[PDB]
Design a protein around this ligand. Structure first.
Ligand SMILES: NC(=O)C1=CN([C@@H]2O[C@H](COP(=O)(O)OP(=O)(O)OC[C@H]3O[C@@H](n4cnc5c(N)ncnc54)[C@H](OP(=O)(O)O)[C@@H]3O)[C@@H](O)[C@H]2O)C=CC1
Ligand SMILES: NC(=O)C1=CN([C@@H]2O[C@H](COP(=O)(O)OP(=O)(O)OC[C@H]3O[C@@H](n4cnc5c(N)ncnc54)[C@H](OP(=O)(O)O)[C@@H]3O)[C@@H](O)[C@H]2O)C=CC1
Ligand SMILES: Cc1nc2ccc3ccc(CNc4ccc5c(c4)CN([C@@H](CCC(=O)O)C(=O)O)C5=O)cc3c2c(=O)[nH]1
Ligand SMILES: Cc1nc2ccc3ccc(CNc4ccc5c(c4)CN([C@@H](CCC(=O)O)C(=O)O)C5=O)cc3c2c(=O)[nH]1
Ligand SMILES: Cc1nc2ccc3ccc(CNc4ccc5c(c4)CN([C@@H](CCC(=O)O)C(=O)O)C5=O)cc3c2c(=O)[nH]1
Ligand SMILES: Cc1nc2ccc3ccc(CNc4ccc5c(c4)CN([C@@H](CCC(=O)O)C(=O)O)C5=O)cc3c2c(=O)[nH]1
Ligand SMILES: O=c1ccn([C@H]2C[C@H](O)[C@@H](COP(=O)(O)O)O2)c(=O)[nH]1
Ligand SMILES: O=c1ccn([C@H]2C[C@H](O)[C@@H](COP(=O)(O)O)O2)c(=O)[nH]1
Lengths: 519, 519
């Protein structure tokens, strides 16, 4: 019994794998991967065999692949004796006897040809699938990878990588299904003694055992459950936080009329070197995000300007009825007060109205941040805060993304940490992630660095009860590789960034999911 | 081949297990545990057997334990036929034939008697050890649990639990050692496909694959390495952060003359319901911690007051030469400036000197925090901050524990989140953990709640290079159960707390390790 694995790279949406006898893209790391995986073996005295259709054989230029043995499936091609590393077979089944002998052949790989893939799957010959998902979907394709039969489940999904601005994943599908329930927590199943003890200890003490307060998500609320030990894609950092509160979230009321399910003190990590963290399990409005960010950067507090750029999130907390209700009825229709941005560019500035000219008043943190970031990178005080005890009363809403710290790595990457006191996982969080990611990129370009990592620390992480069905739907979608975000020009001053300067490359999200805010 | 496990509870330091024919303590959850574990079986048609010395049999009052079969080892006791659930044997070896038959006996448990334990181990009869470590060590003992032979390695260590203010753990030792290197990362070893793929992907991309930037600690710098899937004790949250930077920490210079190894954006969790997070792998000065805390609480900035209470951490940054050096030479010998405490009780207050009377000036956050905490618990704005862009220049040192948020659980527990921009893992961190734990407890008592959980989010988590040998030593010590911290009286106002009011119960740390600070 030998192993038969499929190795293929197909576009994320339509599974395109070829065009006019060539790959529809050029990513060397993937050729490099293909080589590593199909060469990977245990017995130095054996070799792996790569099965492939004749046309694919033509693609390779009919030249052997070092250390391996190529098996071509063709009805015409002569069954030569010449090359000992290349052998021909008349049908796919007969070829797969590599098993039934050639104990010299350690592993088998179905290397391609829509025809050979489709047949390999149909005749149930393959055990595993190594799928490289490539993020370019509006180009011509004439060859495809068949749909993965249900008997196959994903067990791994790598983070997103970039090459020539093209995003791509690496995931492994295994043909499993001799099971039952099976625990999603990867910590269990290692050794019964630990599991039994923990369970019993769990029975004796209850809510007293901290672990019981942090129960692991039940399968039905865990995204792509089959990937148990390979949830490497960072979008799982958010999807899993979602599952975690759905599982442990305490039901509780709040200032808005809609109750939430919340847990306190959570974390999310996101790579920004090889991709941009814009959720794919739901379409996210990047323009709106951007427009709110430069708004902050400018130190603007006039909610009209946002409405004008057709961004309406601050309308609710900007309305005359809301301001009246929170004791700011003297305030104009959309004068949000000394909120973010005002604190960013004018910390402690004495606020009057959204019209006054604050040039010169207060402390300009953003400015200092940028200045300190490039003149003293290793410094441990690169901080930006919006929490001003003295201004709170005048704000239409207290700062949620309360404080952020920046770090310049030794390899000149710029990372960012953000502490968020309150976080609406269903509506806001997706936007916060993207927002601070962009801000970091901007700060990086301006200070001559490149994006590093983004870590987010949440205080009250919650889900509004009116988002339950939406988030359940979102959780049913398997993540796609993150897109790439690039600036079209090098701005000189951070506030010069314009929408046109931004490029969102390779974003292929699932349809948007409507979720209403609580005023 | 049946399984033979030892079940015992012994004091943390001298392994005392008995006194005048009784346990030297009374913890029901542990009796409850003993019952659960020794009853735990797969086959409803079989039973477990509990072997025990005659004296222990006397302890039980010579009455059978429901659902189980007691096997007494005695040279005198009559081999009756009466009770079918109790059977006598002349020597320990003969009794262990429970294996060689009684297929009705599913599992075996060596239940006690220093004599029987010692013999069970000596004759290599036991496969596993369930050890309940109890935290009371200055009481009389006449019976002990022998030292665990080296052939045994710990594979699990629970969090600490409390009963009548007595701390205790639960750990499992397994008699293993048919191995080799073995990876410490619990994520690996699940399925080769994932491991191989990740490794290869790791070869192709490099520092580009985020995972390679977060390498898992190498065994030689991982504390108690054998516990791979059971590092439940929360002291591992700190010990492991230590290992993590020792593994990935980037070497970098800083304001002080001593370079560090640092990583950015880390997290630590600590339970405060069943115990107090005062590290055990090194003796920590709780009094000093306390004295600095009320100092903050009082809004005091006079570093002399600390020196007077024989606390010297702020001396360095208080010296005349340091103040001169940072442009504060006009300042008096120990006038630290608008640091923590001043910002806590007088946010934005216009600072003069450590002598002026600031009563009434600035915003009193602590006061508001306490007020808001009890009048509006579910509120999502329970925040305390020390980061004041306008006062930084006057501070002898910018705030490290920058901002903290508080949360009141539905079950009336008070949890705390802290964001620390810079953290000296070797010298300061241990103290910060304890410090904020205490503060939370104080805030809780005053607001009528009880401690919940403590989560700490670090920005620049680092290790000064002159602490490497010390921390390596610390890492060689296996954690002991956390102690308990209790207040002797209910204070009416948070600033009324006095050292005498505090009780540190059951703290049994390893000798203190001297580690010098960088000015
Ligand atoms: N992205 C990826 O991972 C990969 C992409 N590709 C791409 O796919 C395209 C090549 O594949 P595709 O066009 O399907 O062609 P394939 O490589 O499958 O080759 C088809 C040929 O294989 C032989 N063959 C197929 N089925 C049988 C059968 N049942 N019995 C006998 N012989 C059979 C036939 O050759 P004969 O006529 O001589 O009898 C047939 O013409 C290229 O564009 C290539 O770049 C290829 C591999 C991987
Ligand atoms: N903390 C924990 O987990 C536990 C604590 N304990 C405590 O330990 C104490 C009891 O243990 P300890 O004093 O050692 O007494 P033990 O229970 O070992 O009993 C000793 C007796 O067992 C018989 N025995 C022992 N060895 C042999 C042998 N080699 N051959 C034949 N008979 C043997 C003898 O009885 P005989 O004279 O009649 O021949 C001997 O007097 C109590 O204080 C009890 O509370 C007990 C179990 C667990
Ligand atoms: C995931 C994946 N699967 C594949 C399966 C079959 C393929 C067949 C042809 C090609 C493109 N054509 C060639 C043609 C020749 C070679 C390689 C690819 C790869 N390759 C090297 C690897 C590339 C390198 O040297 O860096 C090898 O050792 O196999 C070749 O010599 C790609 C795939 C992929 C592919 O590109 N990616
Ligand atoms: C209960 C609640 N209140 C808020 C009040 C003000 C906010 C300001 C900013 C953000 C985060 N930033 C953005 C920035 C842009 C959009 C959204 C959020 C949400 N959003 C909606 C559209 C606008 C809307 O929902 O009204 C969407 O789903 O596409 C945006 O376009 C969230 C809130 C919340 C929030 O997330 N939740
Ligand atoms: C970890 C551990 N191991 C032990 C091993 C042997 C012991 C022998 C005697 C006693 C103390 N004496 C008695 C005497 C009688 C009973 C129990 C304990 C426990 N027990 C219940 C459990 C207690 C309960 O009912 O809650 C049982 O089902 O076994 C008894 O009937 C404790 C241990 C421990 C022990 O207390 N803890
Ligand atoms: C480089 C550096 N500088 C500092 C400057 C001021 C600090 C103030 C408070 C704390 C954290 N709080 C405490 C509170 C009490 C003690 C210690 C730290 C350390 N510590 C020493 C004794 C005093 C000393 O080291 O001088 C010990 O190891 O026991 C204490 O007694 C750390 C620093 C650091 C710090 O941790 N590292
Ligand atoms: O960037 C933002 C803006 C605010 N909110 C949400 C969080 C809360 O659901 C609500 C504020 O609630 P309070 O903190 O005011 O109670 O707005 C976000 O999630 N992110
Ligand atoms: O509560 C505290 C007081 C400060 N420090 C340490 C952290 C740094 O090692 C040093 C301050 O360094 P800078 O942030 O000033 O660079 O003091 C702590 O760890 N905890």
């Amino acid at each position: 019994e030998k192993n038969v694995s499929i190795v293929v790279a197909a576009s994320v949406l339509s599974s395109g794998i070829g065009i006019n006898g060539q790959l529809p893209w050029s990513i060397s790391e993937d050729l490099k991967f293909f080589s590593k995986i199909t060469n990977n073996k245990c017995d130095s005295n054996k070799k792996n065999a790569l099965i492939m259709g004749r046309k694919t054989w033509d693609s390779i230029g009919r030249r052997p692949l070092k250390n391996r043995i190529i098996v071509v499936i063709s009805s015409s091609l002569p069954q030569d004796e010449a090359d000992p590393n290349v052998v021909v077979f008349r049908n796919l089944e007969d070829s797969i006897e590599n098993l039934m002998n050639d104990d010299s052949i350690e592993n088998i790989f179905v290397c391609g040809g829509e025809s050979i893939y489709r047949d390999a799957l149909k005749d149930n010959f393959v055990d595993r699938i190594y799928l490289t998902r490539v993020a370019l979907e509006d180009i011509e394709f004439d060859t495809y990878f068949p749909e993965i039969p249900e008997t196959f489940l994903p067990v791994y999904m790598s983070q997103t990588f970039c090459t020539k601005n093209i995003s791509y994943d690496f995931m492994i599908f295994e043909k499993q299904e001799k099971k039952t329930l099976q625990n999603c927590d990867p910590a269990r199943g290692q050794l019964k003694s630990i599991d039994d003890t923990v369970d019993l200890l769990g029975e004796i003490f209850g809510i007293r055992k901290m672990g019981n307060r942090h129960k692991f998500p039940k399968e039905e609320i865990y995204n792509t459950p089959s990937i148990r030990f390979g949830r490497e894609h960072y979008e799982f950092q958010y999807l899993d936080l979602l599952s975690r509160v759905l599982e442990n979230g305490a039901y509780r009321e709040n200032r808005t009329g809609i109750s939430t399910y919340s847990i306190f003190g959570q974390m999310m990590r996101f790579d920004m070197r090889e991709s941009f963290p814009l959720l794919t399990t739901k379409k996210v409005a990047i323009r709106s995000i951007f427009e709110e960010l430069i708004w902050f950067i400018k130190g603007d507090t006039n909610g009209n300007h946002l409405i004008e750029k057709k961004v309406y999130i601050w309308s609710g907390n900007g309305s005359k009825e809301y301001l009246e209700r929170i004791g700011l009825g003297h305030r104009e229709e959309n004068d949000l007060g000394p909120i973010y941005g005002f604190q960013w560019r004018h910390y402690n500035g004495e606020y009057k109205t959204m019209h006054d000219d604050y040039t010169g008043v207060g402390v300009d943190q953003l400015a200092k941040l940028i200045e300190t970031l490039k003149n003293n990178p290793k410094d441990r005080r690169h901080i930006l805060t919006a929490w001003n005890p003295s201004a709170l009363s005048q704000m239409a809403l207290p700062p949620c993304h309360v404080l952020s710290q920046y770090y310049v790595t030794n390899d000149n990457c710029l990372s960012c940490n953000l502490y968020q006191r309150s976080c609406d996982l269903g509506l806001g969080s997706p936007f916060n992630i993207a927002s601070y990611a962009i801000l970091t990129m901007m700060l990086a370009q301006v200070c001559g660095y490149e994006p590093g990592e983004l870590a987010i620390f949440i205080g009250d992480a919650h889900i509004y009860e009116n988002h339950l069905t939406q988030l359940k739907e979102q959780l049913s979608r398997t993540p796609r590789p993150f897109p790439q975000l690039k600036f079209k020009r090098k701005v000189e001053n951070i506030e010069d960034f314009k929408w046109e300067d931004i490029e969102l490359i390779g974003y292929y999200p699932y349809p948007t999911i409507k979720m209403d805010m609580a005023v």
